[PDB]
């Protein structure tokens, strides 16, 4: 499936570091159901022109962008092309590449349990459940003290993005190891057909 | 701004002087791939993705030509106004649980980067390492600045301290982000 790119319109002609940035965002709500398409032209951290499918045409965001916006909306071949990208790019890429790529990626998490400081029965300690290398983001981690789910004393980091299409999250559980106790870490993720559970006998 | 999924396509960045360009595709905040302007090919982050989907390199080259031109125009149209430098922050953390004597990846996440021209290098015991170092492209941020990630392949030794050294015009001197197993 060939990925389609948003095209940038050429600007009308009229130490010191300058940065120009173009981009076409495609917001998909409820799959392909609702789609909003926005392209932004940015000069030095400043968005000076843009196309919003909710508006139906280029609109300068600052005086620097009036020339461009004026011109692009005048030539029918340019406005109609940009305007069509909502189907030409967004919808196409979503129903094609994405659907067969990121939209179906499932990476089961690896979970392990660790004790912060060395174990000393009848002494407070910390239990950490590390859930790593999973995808997509949606995930649930629950702690269990031999049978029953505990929420108090439980603390979790925020979703950490590894940058290579995987996430990780850490979940601490404050507790004190008493012989005969069994702590288990439950993790539910879309990639698993059945919840994963790691045990740690005190 | 509110959506189950966001696909940013054709992200083109260009800067002067030096003619430094970048062309990438992202999805839900992850790079699908980028186009090497020199080798003139498409590099997919997840190689398994390039098997299923493709993208002709010509597309990025062509789009970089436009953006290159627009910078020229917009530069003059504003009396050559300089970009305001920013101070980039760093954060270091392991890709998976640290287990001595076991291959792992140390990650350096640099945020608030602008302009998108930076040097991120590692240091083992203040000795500087250059092997097993992969770097991502610049990712876009809502406030129009960027972030990048650097990865370091390493084996957690008992006593070897690492540092993510960052060099940016927004800093009077490099900032070292320290990370230690214990």
């Amino acid at each position, epitope marked *: 499936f060939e990925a389609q790119k948003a095209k940038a319109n050429k600007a009308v002609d009229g130490e010191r570091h300058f940065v120009y940035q173009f981009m076409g965002e495609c917001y998909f709500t409820n799959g392909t159901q609702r789609i909003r398409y926005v392209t932004r032209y940015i000069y030095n951290r400043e968005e000076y022109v843009r196309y919003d499918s909710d508006v139906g045409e280029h609109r300068a965001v600052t005086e620097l962008g009036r020339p461009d916006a004026e011109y692009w909306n005048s030539q029918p071949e340019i406005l109609e092309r940009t305007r*069509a990208e909502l*189907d030409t790019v967004c919808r196409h890429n979503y129903e094609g590449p994405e659907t067969h790529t990121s939209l179906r990626r499932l990476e089961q998490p690896n979970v392990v349990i660790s004790l912060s400081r060395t174990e000393a029965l009848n002494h407070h300690n910390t239990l950490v459940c590390s859930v790593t290398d999973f995808y997509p983001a949606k995930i649930k981690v629950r702690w269990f003290r031999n049978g029953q789910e505990e929420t108090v004393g439980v603390s979790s980091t925020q979703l950490i993005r590894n940058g290579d299409w995987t996430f990780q999250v850490l979940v601490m559980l404050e507790m004190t190891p008493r012989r005969g106790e069994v702590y288990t870490c439950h993790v539910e993720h879309p990639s698993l057909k059945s919840p994963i559970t790691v045990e740690w006998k005190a | 701004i509110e959506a189950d999924h966001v696909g940013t396509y054709g992200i083109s960045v260009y800067q002067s002087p030096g003619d430094i360009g970048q062309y990438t595709f992202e999805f839900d905040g992850d790079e699908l791939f980028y186009v090497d302007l020199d080798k003139k090919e498409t590099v997919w982050m997840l190689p398994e993705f390039g098997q299923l989907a493709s*993208f002709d390199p010509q597309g990025g080259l062509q789009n970089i030509a436009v953006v290159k031109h627009n910078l020229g125009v917009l530069t003059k149209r504003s009396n050559s106004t300089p970009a305001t430098n920013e101070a980039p922050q760093a954060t270091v953390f392991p890709k998976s649980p640290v287990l001595l004597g076991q291959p792992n990846t140390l990650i350096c996440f640099v945020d608030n980067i602008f302009p998108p021209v930076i040097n991120i290098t590692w240091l083992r015991n203040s000795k500087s390492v250059a092997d097993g170092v992969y770097e991502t492209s610049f990712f876009v941020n809502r406030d129009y600045s960027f972030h990048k990630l650097s990865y370091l392949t390493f084996i957690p030794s008992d006593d070897d301290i690492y540092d993510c050294k960052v060099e940016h015009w927004g800093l009077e001197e490099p900032v070292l982000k320290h990370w230690e197993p214990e």
Partner: T-cell receptor
Amino acid sequence: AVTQSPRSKVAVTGGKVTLSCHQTNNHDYMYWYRQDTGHGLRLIHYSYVADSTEKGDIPDGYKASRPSQENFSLILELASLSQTAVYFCASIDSSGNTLYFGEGSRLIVVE
Amino acid sequence: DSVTQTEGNVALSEEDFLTIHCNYSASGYPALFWYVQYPGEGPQFLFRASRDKEKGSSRGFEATYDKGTTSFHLRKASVQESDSAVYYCALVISNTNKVVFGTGTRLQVLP
């Protein structure tokens, strides 16, 4: 807009021909198509930048040169009987997708 | 990834109904065109359609972008004898800005 040269040209097999194309529309993209009844228009080479070129569907037997952004040359180092056709040069605005052809350059290759 | 025109040669009396079928195959969501070439010159732009259900028209000629049956059939109510020429169906691969042409249909409008 786009003018072609020569309007026509007879050549001997093995001979070297050069079809030149000039454009005023001030476009980045310039193409070269060959026309022959039973095949419509097929792309030989195309260019979007002042120093490069790219192959189309049937570039075999041809070379192109984009010295400037308004001049695009099509070269046949060694004429062939199967290269007898009508060559059309065209252009497009990088921000558009509409082609602008020239009058054409008929080329006959005799034995 | 190409374009196909059903006919290849059409002849009819002035004031008749004209219909030239055109079907396509693309990897993306291409912009569909129609070009016309009058005897003794290059092909020129007629009109376009950037997406499904959209309608392109000009000089009496019109076509509707049909993504469903991947079509773009040309049509005119009453053809005039000055419409005799070659009509091409085109397609634009937006990623590399290449334009694929159909075979072309020759239209003969008997006065």
